[PDB]
Specification:
This is part of a larger assembly, with one copy of chain A (412 residues) and two copies of chain B. Chain A has helices at residues 11-17, 21-33, 38-49, 56-72, 84-108, 113-130, 133-145, 150-167, 170-182, 191-204, 209-216, 231-245, 248-258, 261-267, 269-279, 283-296, 304-323, 331-336, 342-355, 376-406; strands at 328-330, 360-363, 368-371. Chain A has 412 residues and is an all-alpha fold. In chain A, helix 12 (231-245) packs parallel to helix 15. With 556 residues, chain B is α+β, with helices and mostly antiparallel strands. Helices cover 23% and strands 25% of the residues of chain B. Chain B is built from 13 helices and 28 strands. In chain B, the strands form seven sheets. A five-stranded antiparallel beta sheet of chain B has the order 27-4-5-6-28, with no helix packed on it. A four-stranded antiparallel beta sheet of chain B has the order 7-8-9-10, with no helix packed on it. A four-stranded antiparallel beta sheet of chain B has the order 11-12-13-14, with no helix packed on it. In chain B, helix 2 (41-47) packs across helix 4, helix 4 (74-86) packs across helix 5 (96-104) and helix 6 runs parallel beside helix 8 (141-158). The longest helix of chain B is centred in the first third of the chain and has 18 residues, at 141-158. Classes of the chains: A mainly alpha (412), B alpha+beta (556). The interface between B and C is large, with 41 and 36 residues. Chain B: This is Kelch repeat and BTB domain-containing protein 2. Chain B: It holds the Pfam family BTB.
Chain lengths: 412, 556, 564
């Protein structure tokens, strides 16, 4: 259903930008979806997963790396897991986890709400490090029970968002973003983090307009946000969603007024140039750089199907915006406004006319695209006559219905 | 034998504890200065290996419902009883001595072993002599020897503690007569003995005839007798006769503490045996010899080094799983004793010592922090980690040094000074060149940032707050030098290695002058004694003992 | 508040050392001349009696010597070691006296442990004994479990000697209950008659009450003059009493006479998409579809067997491990015909996938089933003991077969594969070669009717039928089932109403599945239309569903609410 082949991915920077379980998931995705580079990706993934005492996903990654190494031993014609890791890691993890559990349950006999919440948050962090998702969720819920202050509520919301991101329970993420935003009277920028979380959750849920709007409000002062999404990928996500959904004036207004996506596009000059060419009717370079960004971000944690749909919408909107200022546009020139051939452009234009929102006619003789501007009166008179014929026909039918009821006509 | 404990041993434990706390079925009660402790006989002997005679021997004690046990603290006996009943010890850092005394009053190997391990691990900076006397009072041979070495080192360090004055004669003889004194001079032990002896009266003068003969004869012909002349009791004649006899005999021999040769500790060197990846070695600037050191974890690498003004070596972090473990190098046993681990698993941490505290700046804490730019320090006295003000900006491959009791961290182009008294960062000067993958040295009152990607020599002064160039190190072209700047013999020098194409690496150190801006040829390290080191090796300055360490065998 | 376990076990083992090495003994239990030097306070940790013995201020509190009577040395010693070290070696014999002494000393934990063991141990040969024990000692949970299981297996057997020595109230509760499983109401009548005639006139006063619980359809017919024969002489307070007594008490049929031959189906297509599969049943007489309880932890890929005593068992199967995810478990379960629930039983030794469960000589035989081993003996055939509640290995099948079926004929196990057949001889535990089929067909089922084996279908499936005779030892063809062409019928061999019927579901092209059953004429070699299952009551079931013969109570079960 997925998995493509493409070189030139920078593994080191993409691995270092993220950190935590998010980095592990992204490295696993990169290894699984990018062949001819799965070896080094899996090696780095196993090197980092061994850190912070993982248990089951470590076994899966070790098996995958062993399979990859075995594959490498046959093409140009498997590493050991060091099972002592199991022993030492299990012993240390059990000792520290039981010590922390003893401390927390002793605090439960002391009955302090804030202390219980903090201990349960620590237990959830320890379980997440161990690779225990449901256990961390339960700990963070027993923490959410014992909340005292607004900052405690904010921390609870952030923890629940982080956990449900891995659990892919994005409904919980959205609910907790709404709770953390609407409640506390909507230098420390927490709303930026909440908006980033909401935007990424919406994008993961196949939403593009609201996700773009939420990302647009994210300020660059947040800077460090590696547990969920890197700033470069945030800029890419926002630019792609805005290009797909926001039309030209909306694009300009939002990008300029935000003043943080200016910096974000400075981090990612490719998206900035693509948007500028979109505004300036340079769709050929826009779409070739779009294909470059395609091959570059086809192996992203939460992008691939969403970004494919986004690119389809982007090319449709580009065609619509390109033909809009013309009443009689040569299809030769329109095809020359991209690397596509005449036949493919004609097929795409026919599909757009069938779907709509281009209002055009294809004079395939000279290959010139003529816009359709029909007089309202001619259409109005035609459909008014059709309505009258339908009204008379329905008048007959209702007139007929009175016959079978006044004369009691039915199946016996 | 089948000894299953699944969901039962804890249940029977709970029955024990519940029916103890309810004062149920009681048959024996301990009277402790009027405090009553109704409890199980069987639990009493299970903890205390002495009680097993207190209620089995056919003496009148067996048929006695009320037993008056004295010379035991009520709090310690209660904590012993509850530790017997629930299994939780929950020992604090203050009542360890009395708890150990009460446990020994029972002579077992459970609570006593636990407290022995705790005391061995808790000899931080000051209680060394106190717990050494404690172990002299109660036989704790393992802790006795550990405290012996620790007291040797720390007492040689401070030699002014009041607890040292109240010591037994045999313990003092063992301490001073040992050849493990970490003293660079022979007169400090002499004056320590003089102040110990002049602390009291004739009773200590009796021990004087036995402790005065444990010092090398160079200090026994000194002004010591001139000071004893005014300090000796009247009408004493044979005392002078026996004092005069302590000049010629008793094998005057050199000590071990004078061998504090200033050497260089290296980590992650090119291992000789292919079965090993990296190794830790040492170099002697004066002896022109290459010594080796044992790897602290023997399997973990990518560690950071720090040297306190008291010449101590510490290792933190490292990876390839990253472990937040901590270690300390023994200057005599050639081993590594672990310490309190860090709360975060760092990759190549930069440890800096200031005001007696170890500061770890950067080094990939978790990376996924809300604020990636954070630091964490260490307490060498309390043996704990204390969170401090976080870093201003996120940096990678950075270096940090200490100048004028202030924390200075260096990155690509920015520098921040951490004020330990207020726990805050203050903006410093900006460097005109962006160079990374380099280290800095704290020589005097100037910071020398050498290398970066090269041969960039950018000198910074704290009193002037400016960055300036001096010169370029003379190095052969078509090469990538590996610069290492460190203070040697109170003189700024460098240790650089040059590598070319199809050429062998050469090791050479140069003497740099402040006003000359030139690296004069000081000494060239011959390849007959030192082999290739590598690329990720680190260098630091410290004092080591040639006898405790071993020479690294390698063919010239 | 958590508890440190390291010093916990150190405590417990050093306590053990003190129990074995007699040191701290101020109190000693004097039982039938046996010394028990122990403590007052470990006896605390175990028992809730000695609090009356020690923490009271009585003569026994001061007495350093106590003469505990009406107890057993072995039971006291095992309870003491249970208190001291923690090993409760519970066997199958001393549990009775263990419970007796636990109730004597009021030790709650060992009471719960032995109650659980007795709940696990309830079976046929000790049902009435355990019910009497639970009547003697108030064990209401065990009392109810007994009552139910006793009702069932006693109505089954009604010949155990311990039934004669029972209290009047227990008999009244048993007989008046509406949970008896009897094909007729006359067997309980004669059971009550033989119970009354078991003893002397001491049963005369209870006779006025036992007849007050039985229906009046037998209180005016025979077995009234028989009591008059056994009446004490010249007693004129009973004959006339019973003459005019059987007016009241509302004659009503019982529940045991409500068992009908029904087709039990497992792993049917779940109506609600939230669940994977479900279990249903077809009523050949009521013409309705009654729902059944879900398999234990949605146990899929299992096998069914029904003993001649009409008992349903489940073995093998896999549970989705906590997208494809499934792990195989060797759990075993038993179906309650009245409570509509699956009672867990002793699990097997090896896990199985689609095992062939066959009953013979009271033993449940599971032949094959894709065992986890896969060694040279890749059959792992093993029988189950219904009286000892344990599994015993049997002689392995000489050849490893996959997707096989097994039936029981003439007290022998007949397992069938693609083309080979082997008969198991339980008396000697050996396998003998049988006749060879001429057609290569698999994924089929067989039903044992009389002394013949009918292998119906095989490969979807087809209408090929090969009839095998045990006395003749030969495979012969009879006919082919007339079905609609261009279809994929799902044949199911089954025996019902002393005849060989088939449950064949057929699906046409671009059409829904149709349910219809046929009656195969044994002498005419023809499948006759016995009944047509309308789609208004029965919906789609799937492909991996199984069918079996059995009897169920429509009263205890509930009709499945689902649109036609």
């Amino acid at each position: 259903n997925y998995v493509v082949e493409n070189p030139s991915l920078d593994l080191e920077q993409y691995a270092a930008s993220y950190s935590g379980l998010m980095r592990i998931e992204r490295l696993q995705f990169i290894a699984d979806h990018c062949p001819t580079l799965r070896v080094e990706a899996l090696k780095m993934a196993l090197s980092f997963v061994q850190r912070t005492f993982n248990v089951d996903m470590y076994e899966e990654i070790h098996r995958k790396l062993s399979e990859a190494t075995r594959e490498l031993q046959n093409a140009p014609d498997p590493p050991a897991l060091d099972t002592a890791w199991v022993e030492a890691t299990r012993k240390k993890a059990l000792l520290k986890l039981e010590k922390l559990d003893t401390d927390l349950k002793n605090y439960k006999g002391n009955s302090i709400k804030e202390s219980i919440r903090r201990g349960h948050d620590d237990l959830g962090d320890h379980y997440l490090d161990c690779g225990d998702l449901s256990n961390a969720l339960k700990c963070y819920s027993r923490a959410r029970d014992y909340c005292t202050s607004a900052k405690h509520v904010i921390n609870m919301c952030l923890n629940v968002i982080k956990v449900s991101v891995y659990l892919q329970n994005w409904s919980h993420v959205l609910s907790y973003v709404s709770k953390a935003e609407s409640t506390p009277e909507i230098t420390q920028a927490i709303l930026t983090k909440l908006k980033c979380a909401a935007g990424l959750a919406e994008l993961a849920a196949r939403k593009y307009k609201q996700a773009a709007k939420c990302l647009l409000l994210a300020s660059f002062d947040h800077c460090d946000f590696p547990e969920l999404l890197s700033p470069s990928n945030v800029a890419i996500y926002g630019g792609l969603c805005a290009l797909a959904t926001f039309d030209r004036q909306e694009l300009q207004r939002n990008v300029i007024s935000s003043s943080s996506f200016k910096l974000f596009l400075e981090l990612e000059p490719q998206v900035r140039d693509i948007i500028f060419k979109f505004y300036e009717s340079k769709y050929a370079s826009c779409l070739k750089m779009l294909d470059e960004m395609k091959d570059n971000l086809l192996l992203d944690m939460y992008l691939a199907p969403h970004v494919r749909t986004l690119y389809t919408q982007i090319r449709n909107r580009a065609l619509i915006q390109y033909f809009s200022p013309y009443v009689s546009a040569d299809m030769h020139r329109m095809a020359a406004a991209f690397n596509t051939t005449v036949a493919a452009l004609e097929d795409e234009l026919t599909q757009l006319i069938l779907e709509g929102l281009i209002s055009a006619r294809v004079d395939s003789h000279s290959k010139i695209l003529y816009a359709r501007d029909v007089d309202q009166r001619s259409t109005t008179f035609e459909k008014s006559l059709l309505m009258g014929k339908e009204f008379q026909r329905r008048a007959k039918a209702m007139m007929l219905r009175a016959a079978v009821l006044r004369n009691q006509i039915h199946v016996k | 034998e089948r000894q299953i404990n699944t969901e039962y041993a804890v249940s029977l434990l709970e029955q024990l504890k519940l029916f103890y706390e309810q004062q149920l079925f009681t048959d024996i009660v301990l009277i402790v200065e009027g405090t009553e402790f109704p409890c199980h006989k069987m639990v009493l002997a299970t903890c205390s290996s002495y009680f097993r005679a207190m209620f089995m021997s056919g003496l009148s004690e067996s048929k006695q419902t009320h037993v008056h046990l004295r010379n035991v603290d009520a709090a310690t006996l209660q904590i012993i009883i509850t530790y017997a009943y629930t299994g939780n010890l929950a020992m604090n850092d203050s009542t360890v001595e009395q708890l150990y005394e009460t446990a020994c009053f029972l002579q077992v190997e459970d609570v006593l072993q636990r407290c022995r391990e705790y005391l061995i691990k808790k000899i931080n900076a000051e209680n060394c002599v106190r717990l050494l006397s404690f172990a002299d009072l109660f036989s704790c041979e393992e802790l006795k020897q550990s405290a012996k070495r620790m007291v040797e080192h720390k007492f040689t360090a401070v030699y002014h503690q009041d607890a040292f004055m109240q010591l037994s004669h045999d313990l003092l003889i063992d301490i001073l007569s040992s050849d493990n004194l970490n003293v660079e001079k022979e007169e400090t032990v002499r004056e320590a003995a003089m102040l110990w002896l002049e602390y009291n009266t004739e009773s200590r003068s009796q021990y004087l005839s036995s402790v005065l003969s444990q010092i090398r004869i160079d200090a026994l012909s000194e002004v010591t007798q001139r000071a004893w002349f005014q300090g000796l009791p009247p009408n004493d004649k044979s005392v002078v006769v026996q004092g005069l006899y302590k000049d010629m005999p008793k094998f005057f021999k050199p000590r071990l503490g004078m061998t504090k040769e200033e050497m260089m500790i290296f980590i992650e060197a090119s291992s000789e045996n292919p079965c090993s990846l990296y190794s830790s070695v040492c170099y002697s600037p004066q002896a022109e010899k290459v010594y080796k050191l044992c790897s602290p974890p023997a399997d973990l690498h990518k560690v950071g080094t720090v040297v306190t003004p008291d010449n101590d070596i510490y290792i933190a972090g490292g990876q390839f799983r990253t472990v937040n473990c901590f270690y300390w190098f023994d200057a005599q046993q050639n081993t590594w004793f672990p310490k309190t681990p860090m709360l975060f698993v760092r990759i190549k941490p930069s440890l800096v010592c200031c005001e007696g505290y170890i500061y770890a700046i950067g080094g990939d804490s978790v990376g996924g922090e809300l604020n990636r730019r954070t630091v964490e320090r260490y307490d060498t006295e309390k043996d704990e980690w204390t969170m401090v003000s976080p870093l201003p900006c996120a940096w990678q491959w950075s270096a940090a040094v200490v100048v004028h009791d202030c924390i200075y961290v260096m990155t690509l182009n920015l520098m921040y000074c951490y004020f330990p008294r207020s726990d805050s960062w203050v903006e410093m000067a900006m460097r005109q060149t962006s160079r990374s993958f380099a280290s800095a040295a704290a020589f005097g009152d100037k910071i020398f940032y050498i290398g970066g990607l090269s041969v960039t020599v950018e000198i910074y002064d704290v009193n002037k707050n400016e960055w300036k160039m001096a010169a370029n190190i003379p190095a052969k072209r078509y090469s990538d030098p590996c610069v290492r700047a460190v203070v040697i013999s109170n003189s700024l020098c460098v240790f650089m290695r040059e590598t070319h194409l199809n050429e062998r690496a050469k090791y050479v150190t140069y003497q740099y002058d402040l006003e000359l801006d030139r690296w004069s040829l000081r000494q060239h390290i011959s390849e007959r004694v030192l082999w290739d080191l590598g690329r990720d090796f680190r260098c630091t300055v410290g004092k080591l003992y040639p006898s405790c360490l071993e020479e690294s065998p390698w063919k010239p």
